[PDB]
Amino acid sequence: DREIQRTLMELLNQMDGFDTLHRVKMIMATNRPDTLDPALLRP
Amino acid sequence: LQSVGQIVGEVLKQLTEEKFIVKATNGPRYVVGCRRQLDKSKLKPGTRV
Amino acid sequence: FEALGIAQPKGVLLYGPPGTGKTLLARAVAHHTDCTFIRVSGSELVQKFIGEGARMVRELFVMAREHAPSIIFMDEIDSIGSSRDSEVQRTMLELLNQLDGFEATKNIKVIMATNRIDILDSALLRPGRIDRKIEFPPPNEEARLDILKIHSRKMNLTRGINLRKIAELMPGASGAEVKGVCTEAGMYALRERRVHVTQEDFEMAVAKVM
Amino acid sequence: GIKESDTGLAPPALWDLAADKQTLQSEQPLQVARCTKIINADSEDPKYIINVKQFAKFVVDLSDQVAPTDIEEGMRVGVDRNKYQIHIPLPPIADPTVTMMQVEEKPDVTYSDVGGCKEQIEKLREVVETPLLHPERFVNLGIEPPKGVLLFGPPGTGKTLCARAVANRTDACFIRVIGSELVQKYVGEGARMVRELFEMARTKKACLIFFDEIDAIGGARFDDGAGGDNEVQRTMLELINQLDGFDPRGNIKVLMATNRPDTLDPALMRPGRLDRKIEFSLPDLEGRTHIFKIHARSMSVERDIRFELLARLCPNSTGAEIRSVCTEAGMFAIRARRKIATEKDFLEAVNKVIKSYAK
Amino acid sequence: DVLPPEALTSDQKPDVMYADIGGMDIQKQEVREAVELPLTHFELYKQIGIDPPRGVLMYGPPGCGKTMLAKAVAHHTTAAFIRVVGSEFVQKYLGEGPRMVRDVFRLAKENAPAIIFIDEIDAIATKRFDAQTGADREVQRILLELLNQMDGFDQNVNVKVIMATNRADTLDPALLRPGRLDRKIEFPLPDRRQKRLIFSTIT
Amino acid sequence: KQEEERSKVDDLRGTPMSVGTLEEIIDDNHAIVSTSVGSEHYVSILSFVDKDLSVLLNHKVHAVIGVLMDDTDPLVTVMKVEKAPQETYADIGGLDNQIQEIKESVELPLTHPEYYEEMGIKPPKGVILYGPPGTGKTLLAKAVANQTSATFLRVVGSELIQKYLGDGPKLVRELFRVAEEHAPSIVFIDEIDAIGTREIQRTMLELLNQLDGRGDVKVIMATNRIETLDPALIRPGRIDRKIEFPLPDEKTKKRIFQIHTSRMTLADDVTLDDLIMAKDDLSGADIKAICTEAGLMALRERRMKVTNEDFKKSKENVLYKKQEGT
């Protein structure tokens, strides 16, 4: 339940917040872009 | 065959150039020193050893 | 108590809204009871490895037994104070057993404090256990005025700061936000390179705390 | 003087000699671990896996005093302190809760204990008792002897007891199960409990197993619940789909029962699960008379009773209530402190239900 | 032997600066008064005497430009700084949650005046509820440990807490209440003369 | 004396002695035991040990070489009230017909089984009590259980809500299972109301199974809201007795006020009669509350001599604490 949301948080702040220098890029796939949390969809 | 498995663990703050705290995984933690040939600067708090 | 022949009350439960003084009363009690004062964060218990719930309640009710006149201020019991986890529940079962310590705990006074009383189950509330419950309400006009005067005794003040107007201006303030508006009046005296706080500073402190 | 603290110990004439000292100084104590995975490279140097709980898991072998002929998966093995070689396979455990479903022997029930429904237990025996004790007509005429049947009748009345009479005359070990015994806070294992039950029954010299409230077990999938107490959906098919029928069944006899048949999965209804279905009702007048005839044995009474009229004073009613009324005439004796029961006790004990349960 | 106190941060020092911010002058000024000044102008506070704020919370639409300010203050600060996100506070092995929280905070105390940064606290700070399962119990324990070390009995040394949150219609008021959240702030979406500043800065 | 044995078997029990828990007695001279670290050991049995099974083990060879006092076992023992209760028939003032009822029903079997097993009869199952809360239900249950050495098992009807199918029936079953594992019991469901009028219905069938399926354990039911119960639950003919407490009558109320005031320092200005004998006034728990609040009232005024006016305002405050009607 809420553990999924906390996992989303872990992603959501690992995905920016500590630094950005990374030679690392993330590709994401979805069958339902609408349901994706707006926080992710952030530009 | 004439070899022994070295223990795997993770280092904490240095005390001297030859004193370093290591957590030995789910076991206890100790203070130990460099063998001879390890770069002290290549050791950081948390580096795996 | 003997002249009434009744048994002494076993414990105290401080409940109500958060930020209303139960912590402050506990700290002030530590200053004046002059019996041995011991305090436990509710989340310090149960913890990790088996027995850390058993040990931290049992030996706690052994050091308390040794110290005889003593106050134990459990804080935020709800962490474990809920209904029902095994060892988790075991910590409360042992706590209930230890507060079932018969006499010689007449010198052992427990004050556990916790906002949001609802979760706290009936197990510890039963008359064989903590008898007393105390709610801490939001202060009224005079009490808000007095807490203003308390948190503002350290202030540097302009002439004629009518604290009554501000106390009237701030209904429903549960006390902690009184300290908040005091700090905030300090804020909006500060950045204007001022030390003499003014009435409208308290007014807009009321404005922004809300 | 000093007080003893519950230390035991026998008197001197009952212990020691050199026997105990030699045994303790000679024999190595054995630690206990679980077994797994006979490595079995070629079956003459097999090796095994063991698990000392909370301590470790090891690859080990046998001490030549024991042979692989006695070792299987799990098998509860015991080894020595330092080289951990298998020294003994330890006996089974009573933990798997099969023990609490056991009756384990011929039940104290006969084919006349049934309250009038002897018709139904006889048609039952045609499909379980007859095709084990009278196999001279099934396979020669074409079909392998059947082994399993379902029952459904009045509210929780007598149904299970039929199974007990059959298992008595069948001379069969008896197991009786409810859905609760396939359920624990730990999930997934609830299905595995049926697997354990059939295996432990086949370790017996053939056994008879019975299930009650099969509606709660043999009831089909409910998707639209969207969760809830969902363990049923994980466990129940492992009965229904791993259950065997007349054809695919080993040396085992099975019996089903529930008061509510309308919800049962057709998979249970169809063969491979069921070989016959039987219906019951509230005990008829002959049945109600016969139940009181049975219970005349169950107490000491003034045995001049007009049970024929007592069964008619009962309107449409069960037979469990008949037992309750007999014990209620016992209550009549007790409240009067009388050493024996009487017909008036029976009459007003019947009225205890008939009047107060139906006023 | 006796070991030094405890047994944290490093020279990471993120790139961003106050020169790099878009121009949230109100928010930058407020947060810097909350954190930077009680390092330098605590000397002035002692004359003013108003018990410097030790806790500030940040409302905002998803990534409204607040963790930007978090990294800015983390880099630019002279005092010690620790950055542990709220979601990081978890465990299999039951019970250590509260202790690791208390370890982080005690470490903060021994590290001299320092600022603990916790992001996404909303993950482990939702309004308390009937903890009918173990996970709920543990997360509520995390919240209560954070609460009680932040005020529960012990007034800390002059440490500060900076927190980030997106929804914050959650966040049990026991956390929200002023004595531990002195000067909470909302970062709204940029608007007239704010968008101009941020275009100018980036461009 | 046994100095020869002291020179032999005390050496056999070479110190120190470890302590563990037995689980199997497979061999008359080898058992299988557990210990603190949770490991399991097939060990030898030395002949001097009692043939009954904490277990005392040799430190080196783990051999069973003693047995010792039991000071453990999980929290179910805490759920159980193993000790015979404290309150007696003398504490229930005037409510005496219920003494006869509960004696006839459930008191006699647990010290006289023959009255329900040998006298040409078979034992009953369960007895229901009803009446307003604080009128003596739990008190009479503890009184009757005090009249025997059996263990008292009280459970409220809505406390056993387990999640998956039949686990509430399991939570009922375990109480009967561990019943004769140490002595028969008096069971008492507080507030039977919940069970009959979705695991609660399966628990109801489990309850009727535990009643009838008879034995030694006697089973008490009780609640104030008896008027709602389904006849499937309160079925007369299987449910044996239906005991009733009226509102505390005059003499009952005198005894209850006297007992509840036995500890505080009364004054002759208040003979409790005015508090006691007028009407259908109050239940016994209301009497206890009145006495407690009067004691507190005297406390705040420092009147460590309780007076009439304390009781007067005690009533004036207490009697308003019940909700209205139409």
Ligand SMILES: Nc1ncnc2c1ncn2[C@@H]1O[C@H](COP(=O)(O)OP(=O)(O)OP(=O)(O)O)[C@@H](O)[C@H]1O
């Ligand atoms: N009556 C009062 N007089 C003075 N200060 C008060 C009063 N009531 C509350 N406060 C202030 O409120 C602040 C917040 O702490 P308080 O003791 O009120 O919290 P609490 O009720 O224990 O709640 P929490 O569980 O949220 O910490 C303190 O700094 C205290 O000085």
Ligand SMILES: Nc1ncnc2c1ncn2[C@@H]1O[C@H](COP(=O)(O)OP(=O)(O)OP(=O)(O)O)[C@@H](O)[C@H]1O
């Ligand atoms: N005013 C601004 N000036 C310059 N860049 C900005 C400004 N506002 C936002 N940004 C850019 O957009 C990002 C906004 O994200 P933010 O700093 O709020 O952190 P986040 O990790 O996205 O937040 P969250 O924790 O809410 O998910 C910044 O990292 C920065 O790159």
Ligand SMILES: Nc1ncnc2c1ncn2[C@@H]1O[C@H](COP(=O)(O)OP(=O)(O)O)[C@@H](O)[C@H]1O
């Ligand atoms: N007429 C009867 N003859 C014998 N036993 C009966 C009768 N009526 C009820 N019973 C009782 O029914 C109980 C179990 O059968 P039942 O509850 O009907 O099984 P199920 O749970 O499948 O309905 C037994 O304890 C038995 O005493």
Ligand SMILES: Nc1ncnc2c1ncn2[C@@H]1O[C@H](COP(=O)(O)OP(=O)(O)O)[C@@H](O)[C@H]1O
């Ligand atoms: N006969 C009695 N003798 C003494 N006290 C009684 C009696 N009846 C009721 N009480 C009081 O009422 C309470 C017990 O009544 P009971 O019906 O068991 O309460 P509950 O409904 O809470 O179980 C006790 O607090 C006791 O003081």
Ligand SMILES: [Mg+2]
């Ligand atoms: Mg507090």
Ligand SMILES: [Mg+2]
């Ligand atoms: Mg951000």
